[PDB]
Amino acid sequence: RIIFDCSHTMAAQILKQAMAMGMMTEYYHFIFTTLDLYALDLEPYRYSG
Amino acid sequence: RIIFDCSHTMAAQILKQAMAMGMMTEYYHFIFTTLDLYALDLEPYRYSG
């Protein structure tokens, strides 16, 4: 159970970090607070479930 | 514990599909069967451990 305050481009970078590290998963109940990341593209992170 | 009869480029394909689907973890203990298994892209799945 993790919560995320951070800029959205850095957040997409940490998406790349975490899905490379295998952490971008349905295992862990997350909550982002990003509202502007929709400009960037999220699709394998969204299809990671 | 799954064993993987597939080509090397097909292995890279399904690796891209699988880390897009978020199913890359140390929990999974696998065996790939392809003779070319050092000659392509190889990195982020090892950092999913």
Side-chain angles (χ1 to χ4, degrees):
Chain A
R1 261 177 293 176
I2 327 176
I3 317 190
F4 299 98
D5 163 60
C6 196
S7 53
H8 80 275
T9 311
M10 178 82 155
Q13 171 45 40
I14 295 159
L15 299 181
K16 301 155 189 169
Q17 289 177 33
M19 202 177 70
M21 290 299 294
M23 275 204 73
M24 190 51 62
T25 50
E26 196 290 296
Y27 306 145
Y28 300 149
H29 185 180
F30 323 100
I31 293 179
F32 270 72
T33 58
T34 52
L35 307 91
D36 280 16
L37 173 68
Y38 63 102
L40 280 164
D41 294 355
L42 305 178
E43 194 149 288
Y45 323 101
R46 93 179 78 191
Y47 292 162
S48 58
Chain B
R1 285 95 66 75
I2 312 180
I3 309 99
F4 291 93
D5 168 353
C6 67
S7 188
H8 48 278
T9 45
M10 187 51 96
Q13 189 32 55
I14 299 170
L15 283 159
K16 292 305 189 308
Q17 288 175 95
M19 184 161 261
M21 283 300 304
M23 211 165 163
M24 276 295 173
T25 339
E26 192 275 344
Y27 303 130
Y28 297 105
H29 177 211
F30 293 151
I31 296 191
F32 277 67
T33 70
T34 175
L35 186 58
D36 292 337
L37 188 35
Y38 45 85
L40 294 102
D41 197 3
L42 299 169
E43 285 313 291
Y45 323 101
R46 97 189 202 176
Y47 310 97
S48 65

XYZ file of all heavy atoms in Angstrom:
804
model
N 0.838 -1.199 0.000
C 0.000 0.000 0.000
C 0.874 1.250 0.000
O 1.433 1.631 1.032
C -0.933 -0.021 1.202
C -2.341 -0.489 0.886
C -3.165 -0.552 2.157
N -2.668 -1.592 3.052
C -3.140 -1.821 4.273
N -4.171 -1.130 4.727
N -2.616 -2.783 5.020
N 0.982 1.881 -1.174
C 1.948 2.938 -1.438
C 1.205 4.140 -2.007
O 0.225 3.995 -2.746
C 3.056 2.501 -2.422
C 3.398 1.017 -2.285
C 4.311 3.294 -2.161
C 4.414 0.538 -3.291
N 1.678 5.341 -1.657
C 1.122 6.594 -2.155
C 2.267 7.407 -2.756
O 3.420 7.292 -2.328
C 0.401 7.389 -1.032
C -0.457 6.457 -0.166
C -0.529 8.453 -1.625
C -1.402 7.136 0.807
N 1.943 8.239 -3.751
C 2.919 8.811 -4.682
C 2.698 10.306 -4.894
O 1.830 10.705 -5.678
C 2.862 8.074 -6.011
C 3.183 6.625 -5.898
C 2.178 5.680 -5.824
C 4.499 6.209 -5.812
C 2.479 4.348 -5.705
C 4.807 4.870 -5.700
C 3.792 3.939 -5.651
N 3.486 11.132 -4.208
C 3.607 12.551 -4.530
C 4.918 12.808 -5.264
O 5.995 12.591 -4.694
C 3.550 13.409 -3.267
C 4.087 14.814 -3.494
O 3.532 15.539 -4.348
O 5.069 15.191 -2.820
N 4.814 13.375 -6.479
C 5.910 13.561 -7.434
C 5.424 14.143 -8.758
O 4.260 13.955 -9.129
C 6.628 12.245 -7.747
S 8.217 12.489 -8.538
N 6.302 14.878 -9.451
C 6.063 15.344 -10.817
C 5.773 14.171 -11.755
O 6.221 13.045 -11.534
C 7.263 16.140 -11.330
O 8.467 15.411 -11.180
N 5.069 14.462 -12.856
C 4.533 13.379 -13.679
C 5.545 12.812 -14.671
O 5.474 11.621 -14.988
C 3.266 13.835 -14.419
C 3.522 14.656 -15.646
N 3.720 16.019 -15.606
C 3.593 14.303 -16.951
C 3.909 16.469 -16.834
N 3.837 15.449 -17.669
N 6.470 13.625 -15.189
C 7.513 13.078 -16.058
C 8.471 12.190 -15.274
O 8.838 11.099 -15.734
C 8.271 14.209 -16.746
O 7.335 15.132 -17.316
C 9.165 13.656 -17.846
N 8.888 12.650 -14.090
C 9.660 11.811 -13.178
C 8.861 10.582 -12.760
O 9.436 9.502 -12.581
C 10.099 12.632 -11.962
C 10.868 11.859 -10.900
S 12.618 11.634 -11.250
C 13.249 11.428 -9.586
N 7.534 10.718 -12.642
C 6.695 9.567 -12.324
C 6.700 8.554 -13.458
O 6.728 7.351 -13.203
C 5.262 10.005 -12.022
N 6.666 9.019 -14.711
C 6.763 8.106 -15.849
C 8.134 7.447 -15.917
O 8.242 6.269 -16.280
C 6.466 8.848 -17.150
N 9.179 8.185 -15.534
C 10.511 7.600 -15.420
C 10.544 6.502 -14.364
O 11.130 5.437 -14.581
C 11.527 8.696 -15.088
C 12.951 8.240 -14.723
C 13.538 7.159 -15.627
O 13.358 7.169 -16.847
N 14.249 6.217 -15.020
N 9.876 6.725 -13.235
C 9.832 5.703 -12.197
C 8.875 4.568 -12.575
O 9.054 3.440 -12.106
C 9.532 6.413 -10.863
C 10.703 7.330 -10.512
C 9.370 5.456 -9.693
C 10.354 8.420 -9.535
N 7.898 4.820 -13.456
C 7.143 3.728 -14.076
C 8.068 2.824 -14.870
O 7.966 1.594 -14.794
C 6.054 4.253 -15.013
C 4.865 5.132 -14.642
C 4.036 5.379 -15.886
C 4.021 4.519 -13.553
N 8.970 3.431 -15.644
C 9.937 2.657 -16.416
C 10.891 1.909 -15.494
O 11.183 0.727 -15.723
C 10.723 3.600 -17.322
C 9.853 4.361 -18.278
C 10.491 5.659 -18.723
C 9.495 6.493 -19.514
N 9.982 7.880 -19.740
N 11.266 2.554 -14.384
C 12.083 1.933 -13.343
C 11.393 0.721 -12.741
O 11.987 -0.352 -12.635
C 12.373 2.955 -12.249
C 13.320 4.044 -12.646
C 13.489 5.054 -11.545
O 13.431 4.712 -10.369
N 13.697 6.311 -11.917
N 10.126 0.868 -12.377
C 9.446 -0.142 -11.584
C 9.005 -1.306 -12.455
O 9.054 -2.462 -12.020
C 8.249 0.473 -10.862
N 8.580 -1.024 -13.687
C 8.200 -2.106 -14.580
C 9.419 -2.820 -15.149
O 9.323 -4.001 -15.498
C 7.310 -1.570 -15.705
C 6.438 -2.631 -16.363
S 5.326 -1.973 -17.620
C 6.491 -1.538 -18.905
N 10.570 -2.143 -15.246
C 11.814 -2.876 -15.449
C 12.166 -3.721 -14.228
O 12.570 -4.879 -14.365
C 12.941 -1.909 -15.787
N 11.991 -3.176 -13.025
C 12.262 -3.931 -11.809
C 11.175 -4.948 -11.478
O 11.341 -5.717 -10.527
C 12.455 -2.989 -10.615
C 13.736 -2.159 -10.649
S 15.251 -3.126 -10.660
C 15.175 -3.872 -9.038
N 10.077 -4.972 -12.230
C 9.020 -5.935 -12.013
C 8.004 -5.548 -10.965
O 7.207 -6.399 -10.553
N 8.001 -4.291 -10.521
C 7.165 -3.861 -9.410
C 5.850 -3.251 -9.862
O 5.002 -2.944 -9.016
C 7.917 -2.845 -8.540
C 8.800 -3.475 -7.488
S 9.143 -2.405 -6.076
C 7.569 -2.431 -5.224
N 5.654 -3.081 -11.167
C 4.466 -2.416 -11.696
C 3.434 -3.518 -11.875
O 3.307 -4.112 -12.945
C 4.795 -1.716 -13.008
C 3.726 -0.788 -13.544
S 3.206 0.376 -12.270
C 4.738 1.258 -11.973
N 2.676 -3.795 -10.814
C 1.913 -5.032 -10.738
C 0.601 -4.840 -9.997
O 0.406 -3.886 -9.243
C 2.679 -6.148 -10.011
O 3.177 -5.651 -8.761
C 3.809 -6.761 -10.848
N -0.293 -5.802 -10.225
C -1.561 -5.951 -9.530
C -1.374 -6.421 -8.088
O -2.331 -6.347 -7.313
C -2.414 -6.913 -10.385
C -3.948 -7.059 -10.200
C -4.396 -7.726 -8.921
O -4.084 -8.919 -8.742
O -5.073 -7.075 -8.101
N -0.150 -6.827 -7.704
C 0.146 -7.241 -6.329
C -0.178 -6.136 -5.333
O -0.803 -6.376 -4.294
C 1.623 -7.617 -6.167
C 2.193 -8.656 -7.102
C 3.511 -8.557 -7.536
C 1.472 -9.785 -7.461
C 4.068 -9.500 -8.373
C 2.019 -10.738 -8.314
C 3.322 -10.590 -8.759
O 3.889 -11.539 -9.580
N 0.236 -4.918 -5.645
C 0.420 -3.866 -4.661
C -0.619 -2.787 -4.930
O -0.745 -2.314 -6.062
C 1.838 -3.305 -4.731
C 2.929 -4.318 -4.461
C 4.174 -4.204 -5.064
C 2.717 -5.382 -3.599
C 5.173 -5.130 -4.819
C 3.696 -6.325 -3.368
C 4.924 -6.191 -3.975
O 5.921 -7.098 -3.706
N -1.406 -2.456 -3.915
C -2.453 -1.448 -4.043
C -1.810 -0.065 -3.979
O -1.398 0.381 -2.906
C -3.501 -1.619 -2.946
C -4.680 -0.696 -3.065
N -5.721 -0.714 -2.163
C -5.013 0.227 -4.000
C -6.627 0.179 -2.518
N -6.219 0.767 -3.627
N -1.742 0.634 -5.103
C -1.095 1.935 -5.117
C -2.149 3.028 -5.191
O -3.327 2.774 -5.449
C -0.173 2.133 -6.325
C 0.589 0.925 -6.769
C 0.152 0.178 -7.853
C 1.810 0.618 -6.198
C 0.880 -0.902 -8.309
C 2.545 -0.460 -6.648
C 2.073 -1.231 -7.699
N -1.687 4.262 -4.978
C -2.440 5.485 -5.241
C -1.421 6.508 -5.721
O -0.567 6.952 -4.949
C -3.183 6.033 -4.001
C -4.317 5.125 -3.524
C -3.753 7.411 -4.297
C -5.034 5.636 -2.295
N -1.503 6.902 -6.985
C -0.825 8.116 -7.403
C -1.631 9.356 -7.060
O -2.846 9.314 -6.865
C -0.504 8.098 -8.890
C 0.823 7.498 -9.192
C 1.025 6.137 -9.070
C 1.889 8.306 -9.552
C 2.261 5.581 -9.334
C 3.129 7.762 -9.817
C 3.316 6.396 -9.706
N -0.917 10.478 -6.988
C -1.522 11.798 -6.923
C -1.203 12.641 -8.152
O -1.349 13.865 -8.110
C -1.055 12.521 -5.662
O 0.375 12.607 -5.670
C -1.489 11.755 -4.428
N -0.737 12.021 -9.232
C -0.475 12.742 -10.471
C -1.764 13.048 -11.226
O -2.658 12.201 -11.329
C 0.470 11.937 -11.361
O -0.037 10.607 -11.513
C 1.857 11.876 -10.736
N -1.859 14.272 -11.755
C -3.029 14.697 -12.513
C -2.706 15.140 -13.933
O -3.629 15.485 -14.679
C -3.786 15.831 -11.802
C -4.247 15.701 -10.346
C -3.210 16.229 -9.368
C -5.588 16.384 -10.136
N -1.434 15.125 -14.335
C -0.995 15.704 -15.600
C -0.215 14.697 -16.431
O 0.314 15.056 -17.490
C -0.137 16.956 -15.376
C -0.964 18.195 -15.075
O -2.159 18.066 -14.743
O -0.411 19.310 -15.175
N -0.141 13.447 -15.978
C 0.596 12.393 -16.657
C -0.125 11.895 -17.909
O 0.485 11.184 -18.717
C 0.855 11.279 -15.634
C 1.459 9.911 -15.931
C 2.916 10.038 -16.331
C 1.315 9.003 -14.724
N -1.384 12.306 -18.113
C -2.171 11.899 -19.275
C -1.579 12.413 -20.582
O -1.881 11.856 -21.644
C -3.628 12.363 -19.135
C -3.847 13.864 -19.076
C -4.299 14.558 -20.192
C -3.616 14.585 -17.908
C -4.512 15.926 -20.147
C -3.829 15.952 -17.856
C -4.273 16.615 -18.979
O -4.475 17.976 -18.934
N -0.789 13.494 -20.524
C -0.029 13.949 -21.685
C 0.926 12.862 -22.161
O 1.122 12.677 -23.368
C 0.735 15.227 -21.343
N 1.523 12.136 -21.225
C 2.426 11.043 -21.531
C 1.619 9.758 -21.690
O 0.428 9.701 -21.379
C 3.474 10.890 -20.428
C 4.655 11.857 -20.474
C 5.394 11.862 -19.146
C 5.592 11.487 -21.609
N 2.279 8.718 -22.186
C 1.609 7.491 -22.583
C 1.933 6.373 -21.599
O 3.074 6.240 -21.147
C 2.010 7.100 -24.006
C 1.520 8.101 -25.038
O 0.784 9.038 -24.657
O 1.875 7.960 -26.226
N 0.910 5.576 -21.267
C 0.910 4.759 -20.058
C 0.609 3.288 -20.312
O 0.349 2.551 -19.352
C -0.098 5.310 -19.043
C 0.097 6.777 -18.668
C -0.971 7.268 -17.703
C 1.494 6.963 -18.114
N 0.623 2.848 -21.572
C -0.148 1.667 -21.959
C 0.395 0.334 -21.432
O -0.423 -0.484 -20.973
C -0.341 1.657 -23.477
C -1.395 0.687 -23.905
C -2.125 1.120 -25.149
O -2.928 2.073 -25.057
O -1.907 0.506 -26.212
N 1.701 0.011 -21.497
C 2.130 -1.226 -20.821
C 2.035 -1.137 -19.309
O 1.856 -2.166 -18.647
C 3.578 -1.407 -21.290
C 4.038 -0.050 -21.569
C 2.855 0.628 -22.190
N 2.140 0.065 -18.748
C 1.909 0.237 -17.320
C 0.434 0.066 -16.985
O 0.098 -0.465 -15.921
C 2.411 1.609 -16.872
C 3.679 2.040 -17.573
C 3.630 2.945 -18.624
C 4.920 1.548 -17.187
C 4.767 3.344 -19.277
C 6.073 1.939 -17.844
C 5.983 2.841 -18.886
O 7.105 3.259 -19.548
N -0.455 0.496 -17.883
C -1.880 0.271 -17.674
C -2.259 -1.180 -17.944
O -3.143 -1.715 -17.268
C -2.708 1.263 -18.513
C -3.172 0.816 -19.896
C -3.985 1.878 -20.576
N -3.152 2.932 -21.133
C -3.622 4.081 -21.601
N -4.926 4.316 -21.588
N -2.790 4.990 -22.089
N -1.610 -1.837 -18.904
C -1.896 -3.235 -19.177
C -1.112 -4.187 -18.292
O -1.266 -5.403 -18.429
C -1.664 -3.576 -20.651
C -2.651 -2.913 -21.582
C -2.390 -2.803 -22.941
C -3.891 -2.485 -21.120
C -3.315 -2.234 -23.798
C -4.799 -1.890 -21.960
C -4.512 -1.770 -23.298
O -5.439 -1.201 -24.138
N -0.282 -3.670 -17.390
C 0.290 -4.506 -16.346
C -0.697 -4.843 -15.233
O -0.381 -5.688 -14.389
C 1.528 -3.821 -15.764
O 1.200 -2.545 -15.248
N -1.867 -4.205 -15.192
C -2.964 -4.692 -14.382
C -3.024 -4.110 -12.992
O -3.888 -4.518 -12.207
N 6.403 -22.446 -12.733
C 7.417 -23.302 -13.353
C 6.931 -23.720 -14.737
O 6.190 -24.694 -14.882
C 7.724 -24.518 -12.487
C 8.579 -24.237 -11.262
C 7.709 -23.999 -10.039
N 6.982 -25.201 -9.642
C 7.513 -26.254 -9.030
N 8.742 -26.202 -8.539
N 6.745 -27.294 -8.749
N 7.351 -22.974 -15.756
C 6.930 -23.184 -17.135
C 8.196 -23.318 -17.976
O 9.253 -22.783 -17.629
C 6.005 -22.032 -17.636
C 4.902 -21.722 -16.616
C 5.315 -22.350 -18.973
C 3.962 -20.618 -17.030
N 8.081 -24.041 -19.092
C 9.184 -24.305 -20.007
C 8.744 -23.839 -21.388
O 7.574 -23.995 -21.757
C 9.583 -25.802 -20.015
C 9.820 -26.334 -18.593
C 10.859 -26.033 -20.809
C 8.643 -27.101 -17.980
N 9.673 -23.263 -22.151
C 9.314 -22.344 -23.228
C 9.917 -22.771 -24.559
O 11.056 -22.418 -24.878
C 9.767 -20.950 -22.844
C 8.979 -20.381 -21.723
C 9.419 -20.523 -20.418
C 7.764 -19.768 -21.958
C 8.683 -20.028 -19.374
C 7.022 -19.262 -20.912
C 7.486 -19.391 -19.617
N 9.119 -23.474 -25.353
C 9.486 -23.867 -26.708
C 9.095 -22.665 -27.562
O 7.926 -22.504 -27.924
C 8.769 -25.169 -27.075
C 8.830 -25.562 -28.576
O 9.304 -24.841 -29.480
O 8.334 -26.672 -28.860
N 10.083 -21.839 -27.909
C 9.884 -20.733 -28.836
C 11.230 -20.277 -29.378
O 12.281 -20.539 -28.788
C 9.179 -19.550 -28.160
S 10.169 -18.749 -26.880
N 11.174 -19.603 -30.529
C 12.349 -19.020 -31.164
C 12.943 -17.913 -30.291
O 12.319 -17.420 -29.357
C 11.995 -18.466 -32.543
O 13.163 -18.071 -33.243
N 14.160 -17.496 -30.648
C 14.850 -16.446 -29.902
C 14.195 -15.083 -30.104
O 13.985 -14.336 -29.140
C 16.324 -16.406 -30.301
C 16.554 -16.413 -31.781
N 16.536 -17.569 -32.530
C 16.804 -15.405 -32.648
C 16.765 -17.273 -33.797
N 16.932 -15.966 -33.895
N 13.901 -14.721 -31.355
C 13.193 -13.471 -31.604
C 11.762 -13.542 -31.090
O 11.227 -12.540 -30.599
C 13.211 -13.145 -33.094
O 12.901 -14.326 -33.843
C 14.585 -12.640 -33.503
N 11.149 -14.726 -31.153
C 9.855 -14.929 -30.514
C 9.967 -14.859 -28.997
O 9.037 -14.382 -28.334
C 9.269 -16.274 -30.942
C 7.844 -16.527 -30.472
S 6.723 -15.170 -30.851
C 6.007 -15.779 -32.373
N 11.094 -15.319 -28.436
C 11.332 -15.147 -27.006
C 11.406 -13.678 -26.628
O 10.784 -13.268 -25.650
C 12.610 -15.862 -26.565
N 12.132 -12.869 -27.413
C 12.180 -11.424 -27.176
C 10.803 -10.785 -27.317
O 10.442 -9.895 -26.534
C 13.174 -10.768 -28.133
N 10.015 -11.259 -28.288
C 8.649 -10.782 -28.488
C 7.785 -11.034 -27.262
O 7.106 -10.129 -26.764
C 8.041 -11.465 -29.715
C 6.692 -10.917 -30.192
C 6.492 -9.425 -29.970
O 7.296 -8.593 -30.400
N 5.407 -9.080 -29.293
N 7.801 -12.266 -26.762
C 6.935 -12.611 -25.647
C 7.484 -12.021 -24.348
O 6.717 -11.728 -23.430
C 6.757 -14.140 -25.613
C 6.094 -14.587 -26.913
C 5.841 -14.592 -24.489
C 6.081 -16.072 -27.102
N 8.802 -11.789 -24.266
C 9.364 -11.008 -23.164
C 8.800 -9.598 -23.147
O 8.444 -9.077 -22.081
C 10.888 -10.948 -23.258
C 11.819 -12.098 -22.876
C 13.163 -11.901 -23.552
C 11.996 -12.190 -21.386
N 8.725 -8.963 -24.323
C 8.146 -7.627 -24.406
C 6.665 -7.660 -24.055
O 6.181 -6.807 -23.302
C 8.335 -7.063 -25.815
C 9.773 -6.763 -26.200
C 10.454 -5.830 -25.228
C 11.803 -5.391 -25.772
N 12.634 -6.558 -26.190
N 5.968 -8.712 -24.496
C 4.557 -8.904 -24.168
C 4.335 -9.158 -22.685
O 3.316 -8.740 -22.125
C 4.012 -10.065 -24.980
C 3.846 -9.724 -26.420
C 3.425 -10.910 -27.225
O 2.247 -11.111 -27.453
N 4.389 -11.695 -27.683
N 5.299 -9.784 -22.026
C 5.120 -10.299 -20.684
C 5.469 -9.232 -19.669
O 4.789 -9.096 -18.647
C 5.984 -11.542 -20.471
N 6.520 -8.464 -19.945
C 6.828 -7.324 -19.104
C 5.929 -6.132 -19.440
O 5.771 -5.229 -18.610
C 8.321 -6.992 -19.256
C 8.869 -5.875 -18.378
S 10.661 -5.930 -18.232
C 10.856 -6.741 -16.647
N 5.258 -6.152 -20.600
C 4.098 -5.287 -20.786
C 2.918 -5.746 -19.940
O 2.167 -4.918 -19.414
C 3.710 -5.243 -22.262
N 2.729 -7.058 -19.800
C 1.667 -7.564 -18.939
C 2.053 -7.624 -17.463
O 1.196 -7.947 -16.634
C 1.224 -8.949 -19.415
C 0.335 -8.917 -20.648
S -1.198 -7.991 -20.445
C -1.903 -8.809 -19.019
N 3.296 -7.309 -17.105
C 3.649 -7.181 -15.703
C 3.872 -8.469 -14.940
O 3.789 -8.464 -13.709
N 4.161 -9.575 -15.627
C 4.203 -10.900 -15.016
C 5.640 -11.369 -14.789
O 5.916 -12.574 -14.782
C 3.434 -11.902 -15.882
C 2.757 -13.044 -15.118
S 1.533 -13.944 -16.092
C 1.358 -15.447 -15.130
N 6.570 -10.438 -14.597
C 7.984 -10.763 -14.480
C 8.375 -10.610 -13.017
O 8.493 -9.484 -12.518
C 8.805 -9.832 -15.369
C 8.870 -10.301 -16.804
S 9.721 -11.854 -17.069
C 9.373 -12.084 -18.804
N 8.580 -11.732 -12.327
C 8.945 -11.682 -10.919
C 9.815 -12.885 -10.575
O 9.837 -13.890 -11.289
C 7.717 -11.678 -9.990
O 6.547 -11.251 -10.694
C 7.943 -10.695 -8.865
N 10.526 -12.761 -9.446
C 11.370 -13.827 -8.911
C 10.564 -15.046 -8.479
O 11.130 -16.142 -8.387
C 12.178 -13.257 -7.733
C 13.348 -14.089 -7.172
C 12.928 -15.132 -6.145
O 11.795 -15.042 -5.628
O 13.735 -16.036 -5.846
N 9.259 -14.872 -8.253
C 8.372 -15.973 -7.896
C 8.366 -17.014 -9.005
O 8.444 -18.223 -8.760
C 6.962 -15.433 -7.702
C 6.816 -14.345 -6.680
C 6.150 -13.173 -7.009
C 7.326 -14.478 -5.397
C 6.002 -12.154 -6.100
C 7.185 -13.456 -4.471
C 6.519 -12.297 -4.833
O 6.361 -11.274 -3.928
N 8.267 -16.534 -10.234
C 8.318 -17.350 -11.430
C 9.713 -17.934 -11.603
O 10.702 -17.194 -11.628
C 7.971 -16.464 -12.610
C 6.576 -15.926 -12.516
C 6.356 -14.604 -12.160
C 5.477 -16.746 -12.722
C 5.086 -14.103 -12.043
C 4.200 -16.260 -12.590
C 4.014 -14.935 -12.259
O 2.739 -14.434 -12.160
N 9.803 -19.255 -11.727
C 11.075 -19.908 -12.018
C 10.936 -20.724 -13.297
O 10.261 -21.755 -13.309
C 11.516 -20.776 -10.842
C 12.774 -21.544 -11.093
N 13.022 -22.773 -10.521
C 13.863 -21.252 -11.845
C 14.210 -23.204 -10.907
N 14.737 -22.304 -11.717
N 11.627 -20.300 -14.354
C 11.328 -20.738 -15.710
C 12.551 -21.329 -16.393
O 13.666 -21.292 -15.872
C 10.790 -19.599 -16.572
C 9.455 -19.104 -16.149
C 9.086 -17.792 -16.380
C 8.529 -19.974 -15.609
C 7.832 -17.350 -16.027
C 7.289 -19.534 -15.233
C 6.929 -18.230 -15.461
N 12.312 -21.919 -17.568
C 13.356 -22.459 -18.438
C 12.991 -22.138 -19.883
O 11.939 -22.565 -20.365
C 13.528 -23.984 -18.286
C 14.010 -24.378 -16.882
C 14.481 -24.510 -19.357
C 14.453 -25.818 -16.736
N 13.846 -21.391 -20.576
C 13.692 -21.207 -22.012
C 14.580 -22.173 -22.778
O 15.673 -22.528 -22.335
C 14.001 -19.781 -22.455
C 12.855 -18.841 -22.290
C 12.385 -18.499 -21.035
C 12.234 -18.307 -23.409
C 11.322 -17.628 -20.895
C 11.170 -17.440 -23.280
C 10.713 -17.099 -22.022
N 14.099 -22.576 -23.950
C 14.677 -23.680 -24.703
C 15.486 -23.256 -25.923
O 15.877 -24.122 -26.711
C 13.576 -24.650 -25.127
O 12.757 -24.031 -26.126
C 12.728 -25.052 -23.929
N 15.753 -21.970 -26.116
C 16.256 -21.514 -27.404
C 17.778 -21.450 -27.375
O 18.381 -21.043 -26.375
C 15.652 -20.159 -27.803
O 16.265 -19.689 -29.011
C 15.786 -19.118 -26.699
N 18.392 -21.924 -28.464
C 19.847 -22.010 -28.542
C 20.483 -20.630 -28.595
O 21.449 -20.351 -27.874
C 20.254 -22.832 -29.763
C 21.749 -23.121 -29.886
C 22.262 -23.854 -28.656
C 22.047 -23.907 -31.154
N 19.956 -19.755 -29.440
C 20.304 -18.343 -29.360
C 19.616 -17.798 -28.123
O 18.406 -17.575 -28.118
C 19.864 -17.603 -30.616
C 20.651 -18.016 -31.839
O 21.784 -18.517 -31.675
O 20.139 -17.837 -32.963
N 20.374 -17.611 -27.051
C 19.810 -17.013 -25.855
C 20.909 -16.190 -25.181
O 21.166 -16.303 -23.982
C 19.236 -18.118 -24.963
C 18.408 -17.949 -23.689
C 17.506 -16.744 -23.818
C 17.590 -19.208 -23.458
N 21.581 -15.355 -25.979
C 22.561 -14.387 -25.497
C 22.773 -13.261 -26.504
O 23.569 -12.349 -26.258
C 23.899 -15.074 -25.184
C 24.379 -16.058 -26.232
C 25.102 -15.631 -27.340
C 24.114 -17.420 -26.104
C 25.543 -16.528 -28.294
C 24.551 -18.324 -27.053
C 25.264 -17.870 -28.144
O 25.707 -18.759 -29.092
N 22.071 -13.313 -27.637
C 22.435 -12.525 -28.809
C 21.417 -11.444 -29.158
O 21.386 -10.978 -30.299
C 22.651 -13.446 -30.007
N 20.590 -11.030 -28.207
C 19.491 -10.106 -28.473
C 19.468 -9.106 -27.327
O 20.457 -8.935 -26.605
C 18.153 -10.848 -28.629
C 17.968 -11.794 -29.816
C 18.125 -13.235 -29.363
C 16.604 -11.580 -30.465
N 18.338 -8.438 -27.137
C 18.165 -7.655 -25.928
C 17.824 -8.591 -24.779
O 17.118 -9.588 -24.958
C 17.063 -6.615 -26.105
C 17.118 -5.529 -25.055
O 18.046 -5.545 -24.219
O 16.222 -4.660 -25.056
N 18.325 -8.260 -23.592
C 18.387 -9.242 -22.516
C 18.236 -8.632 -21.133
O 18.302 -9.375 -20.150
C 19.731 -10.009 -22.565
C 20.200 -10.859 -23.754
C 21.661 -11.253 -23.595
C 19.319 -12.083 -23.949
N 18.039 -7.328 -21.010
C 18.349 -6.707 -19.729
C 17.206 -6.628 -18.713
O 17.356 -7.265 -17.666
C 18.973 -5.326 -19.953
C 20.402 -5.418 -20.429
C 21.204 -6.397 -19.592
O 21.460 -6.086 -18.411
O 21.553 -7.482 -20.102
N 16.055 -5.959 -18.968
C 15.171 -5.569 -17.841
C 14.543 -6.728 -17.094
O 14.162 -6.566 -15.932
C 14.084 -4.726 -18.515
C 14.045 -5.219 -19.892
C 15.440 -5.565 -20.257
N 14.491 -7.905 -17.706
C 13.851 -9.051 -17.083
C 14.738 -9.600 -15.982
O 14.248 -10.199 -15.017
C 13.550 -10.096 -18.153
C 13.136 -9.442 -19.453
C 14.036 -9.300 -20.511
C 11.843 -8.965 -19.621
C 13.661 -8.689 -21.685
C 11.459 -8.355 -20.795
C 12.374 -8.216 -21.818
O 11.991 -7.623 -22.992
N 16.047 -9.386 -16.114
C 16.974 -9.794 -15.074
C 16.858 -8.868 -13.872
O 17.068 -9.304 -12.736
C 18.394 -9.812 -15.648
C 19.237 -8.581 -15.394
C 20.515 -8.585 -16.174
N 21.493 -7.712 -15.547
C 22.744 -7.575 -15.961
N 23.134 -8.151 -17.088
N 23.566 -6.762 -15.316
N 16.452 -7.615 -14.091
C 16.241 -6.689 -12.994
C 14.854 -6.818 -12.401
O 14.580 -6.215 -11.361
C 16.513 -5.249 -13.438
C 17.836 -5.095 -14.153
C 17.901 -5.091 -15.534
C 19.016 -4.912 -13.443
C 19.100 -4.954 -16.198
C 20.224 -4.759 -14.097
C 20.256 -4.777 -15.476
O 21.452 -4.647 -16.137
N 14.002 -7.636 -13.005
C 12.812 -8.127 -12.337
C 13.100 -9.420 -11.595
O 12.186 -10.001 -10.999
C 11.681 -8.333 -13.347
O 12.004 -9.353 -14.275
N 14.349 -9.882 -11.643
C 14.855 -10.924 -10.777
C 14.299 -12.297 -11.038
O 14.371 -13.150 -10.151
